C-alpha angles and dihedrals in degrees: 000000000000143000118191152159117212141176107226124189123208090216131037092195130039139165130218112297096021123123119235117195119214115200118197104212132185127197127198099344103166114241093343115191105164150323150220116217135184112201126187127204134161109260092201089063107028134035122193112231134182122245087266093056104256125127121258121255128210088275104043118122120212118255122280120271130196097279133047089045099110125103101257090125101279118214115203127180130163129190106182129180105204095179093058095035099246127144112189118177142160124207121172143143113252100191093074096159091059091043092051090046093054085059096207108110120195099233101153131041148064114316097185143350125218120192116207127196111219109232099175131022098238138118109276139165140214120203143155111254134192116251135189091237094062102044102174095056130134105217088331096313132113117183124185132204126219092269088060095251126134116253100238106182143009106057130098122224104217111203168182105047108206130200123199095011088161088070096052098114092060086056 
């Protein structure tokens, strides 16, 4: 009887130059309308790249998932720190009246996809992390319902996602 957000990798193992795709998935989040997320990775090991192969900038949004793609006036803002390895982004529907009226809330699916180039073959992790700039977060996550209120208890944050776990002893 579970509600969750999770970072899922398409590969558990990857060599230098490969792309690993991280999917940020939610499951059974009641009346979900949007989120703000603060994700941490190690910039010596992974580099976020767009679907066309170019590095993110401070302003780059993650790739589209399978939800939050409908025309209920989507607001999208990213504020990334690529030197420290932080992706911070907000994606939410703004026409909440119309979204409520359509009566078909997007409670389960992929909110965003981040592709990472593997720079070093080494054990590394990706997690959500609390940050000063987003003070109301639960392990670096803020989820909103279709009234515009923060969801305050009853979902698990499943993390970290780990690549190259088999090489952990060497780290």
